[PDB]
Design a protein around this nucleic acid. Structure first.
Ligand code: ZN
Length: 666
RNA sequence: GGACGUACGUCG
RNA sequence: CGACGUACGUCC
């Protein structure tokens, strides 16, 4: 209530009737600005004619919040305020929704699918297209697809009333720009992709913005890595033994990847072992009986090496016992879903050194200095103020549980309560109830950002130009810190240049707000034009579909799974097997997180039906009334019967063959 | 199942 | 400048 001067002036160009890229770093400010803009838009229409606005919410929580906010704001107006989503798109057709409501709030993908298949022949039905967080307008984004559908009708000479763009954001972003020239080029490209002429930033009332902006102070706490790593040495010896054992089956193991000398525990060995896996998945022998065992042994060795590398990576950022508990949980999970002579030997090799690793993990002298520095900087702040509701940001999801267990099992800090929050990638109610009780948790160990904190700790975290600003984080301003822990000087340089890029944009927008909107347009129109030109020139024609009958086999077992002639495409994205010989080739299991996506309902998970393979094949759903399995070519190999050469595809779009549509008749 | 984005890393 | 790997997140 009582719109302040800063948020009244920030919405002036949008109310004047211009497409704006309003940039407000507040949470409530953007919401109130959007509400005032929708009010001034739906109130400036004459008698008879009625307006129609759409608020493009990107996330389900943001959509559910904005729908309730709009419903509570426009209650004494007679304005229909509804909303579409992934669960409501089934019934209540979107055409009748838009033709009977004045304020629609839908996650874009719905409008993209509508504009694509059958619905919304043109966006001229809308009169306002408020894009929440327009900075996400990038390559192949749903916002970008909506803007492409808009720019096609705009530049194609189609006479029609085009809707306005009121794109709200908190940071226009810089991307990979090096200088102010490249920053201005990127900002102009974003303006052309959004078809706007004003970038509204608060200039007159700076004190009202600085009162609540949530601008904390940075504090770099770079620490050196561990010197005496006995756990790392033992795991490296185990990895060397595993590689020496795997070399006995595949002679040219070093000649399968073009990667140079690599070190254990780095991100390079992971790519090297993944390349070795993808080069061993095409191993073919004329016996076709020994290959099914050779490829299986190689897959098991590669999986063990990948788990060892993941344990070595977790050990560098967490306790020495957490990386061992990870391997113990992995071995416990794998010791039930099949046990052959190779997996038993690997388990025995691991158990021969588990006893030795337990002593080194329990030894408190081998504690990494990074967690010591973290506890040291946490205690000095919680002693100064025993009310700091801090938030911790890490990179890996497996490190969230590690930091939670570290906070739990530490006698130095007792006043801390774990606030583990990873994301679905968990569920929506689990994500909502954990953020609700945040006024009795003390620390929130999250991995990716209504969170008004006063202390942030980026424990080995790096990202875009800014990974700290919270769009929906208005709250209040009373002094906060942005502590950054790291061990790789590279990251420290990244964070040193990001704060520069910030000022870069601060000068770029200031240089762009001086140009008279005329020339601005005279440029951005040419830019978007060129863009459409590239969209028309760059178009790979559909290659001749290979009309043979090849056989899709297992990924790790090389068993005859199914035939390509039995593959049916449901909706150009899902592929099922319409056969009777394939139903006995897989086993079903209950799904951990069942859900539905606009056409199906995830019921079960289908795995390989072999003796000790148990490879993840795909899901099993019910299309409309009948239940079919949806497989993923990613977990499949493609062997031809004519030539015999095998191929590995990651996505279905890369697979060029006779895509027979799914006929419900058979 | 699929699409999309961001970060890191390897390659020619 | 292109492909590719992984991690994380979002949506349908
Ligand atoms: Zn198999």
């Amino acid at each position: 209530f009582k719109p302040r001067n800063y948020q009244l002036e920030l919405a002036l160009p949008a109310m004047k009737g211009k497409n704006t890229i309003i940039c407000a770093p507040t949470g409530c400010g953007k919401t109130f600005v959007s509400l005032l803009i929708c009010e001034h838009h739906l109130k400036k229409f004459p008698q008879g004619q009625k307006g129609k606005v759409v608020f493009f919410a990107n996330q389900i929580p943001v959509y559910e919040q904005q729908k309730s906010v709009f419903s509570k704001y426009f209650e004494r107006h007679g304005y229909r305020v509804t909303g579409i989503s992934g669960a409501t798109a089934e019934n209540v057709p979107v055409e009748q929704i838009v033709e009977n409501n004045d304020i629609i709030i839908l996650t874009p993908q719905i409008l993209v699918n509508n504009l694509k298949k059958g619905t919304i022949p043109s966006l001229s039905i809308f009169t306002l297209m408020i894009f929440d967080e327009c900075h996400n307008t990038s390559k192949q984004h749903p916002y970008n697809m909506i803007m492409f559908n808009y720019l096609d009708q705009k530049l194609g000479g189609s006479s029609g009333p085009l809707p306005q763009v009121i794109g709200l954001t908190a940071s226009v972003g810089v991307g990979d720009a090096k200088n102010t020239d490249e920053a201005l080029d990127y900002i102009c490209k974003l303006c052309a992709s959004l078809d706007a002429s004003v970038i509204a930033t608060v200039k007159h009332n700076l004190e009202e913005l600085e009162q609540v902006v949530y601008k904390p102070q940075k504090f770099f706490r770079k620490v050196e890595s561990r010197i005496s790593d006995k756990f790392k040495y033992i795991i490296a010896q185990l990895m060397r033994d595993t590689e020496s054992l795997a070399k006995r089956i595949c002679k040219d193991l070093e000649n399968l990847s073009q990667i140079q000398n690599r070190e254990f525990g780095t991100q390079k060995y992971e790519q090297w072992i993944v390349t070795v896996q993808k080069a061993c998945m095409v191993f073919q022998m004329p016996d076709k009986d020994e290959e099914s065992r050779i490829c299986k042994a190689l897959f098991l060795y590669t999986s063990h090496l990948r788990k060892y590398n993941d344990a070595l990576i977790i050990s560098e950022h967490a306790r020495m016992k957490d990386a061992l508990d990870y391997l113990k949980d992995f071995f416990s999970n794998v010791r039930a879903a099949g046990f052959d002579e190779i997996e038993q030997d690997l388990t025995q090799r691991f158990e021969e050194k588990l006893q030795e690793l337990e002593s080194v993990s329990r030894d408190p002298s081998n504690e990494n200095p990074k967690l010591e520095d973290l506890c040291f900087i946490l205690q000095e702040e919680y002693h100064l103020n025993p009310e700091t509701i801090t938030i911790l940001f890490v990179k890996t999801r497996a490190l969230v549980d590690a930091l939670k267990n570290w906070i739990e099992g530490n006698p130095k800090l007792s006043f801390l309560k774990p606030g583990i929050l990873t994301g679905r990638g968990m569920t929506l109610p689990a994500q909502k109830c954990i953020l609700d009780a945040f006024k009795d948790h003390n620390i929130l160990i999250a991995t990716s950002v209504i969170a008004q904190c006063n202390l942030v700790i980026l424990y080995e975290y790096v990202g875009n130009v800014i990974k700290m600003i919270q769009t929906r984080g208005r709250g209040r301003a009373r002094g906060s810190k942005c502590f950054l822990l790291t061990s790789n000087a590279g990251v420290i340089e990244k964070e040193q240049i990001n704060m520069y890029k910030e000022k870069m944009m601060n000068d770029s927008i200031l240089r762009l707000q001086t140009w008279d909107e005329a020339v601005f347009r005279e440029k951005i129109l040419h830019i978007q034009t060129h863009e459409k030109f590239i969209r028309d020139s760059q178009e790979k024609p559909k290659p001749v579909p290979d009309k043979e009958n090849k056989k899709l086999l297992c990924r790790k077992c090389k068993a005859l799974a199914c035939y390509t002639a039995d593959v049916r495409v449901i909706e150009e994205c899902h592929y099922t097997v319409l056969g009777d010989a394939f139903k006995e080739c897989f086993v079903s299991r209950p799904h951990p997180k069942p859900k539905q996506f606009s056409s199906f309902e995830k019921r079960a998970k289908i795995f390989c039906a072999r003796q000790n393979c148990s490879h993840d094949w795909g899901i099993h759903v019910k299309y409309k009334t009948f239940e079919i399995p949806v497989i993923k070519i990613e977990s499949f190999v493609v062997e031809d019967i004519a030539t015999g050469v095998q191929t590995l595809y990651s996505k279905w779009k890369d697979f060029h063959f006779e895509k027979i549509p799914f006929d419900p008749a058979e």
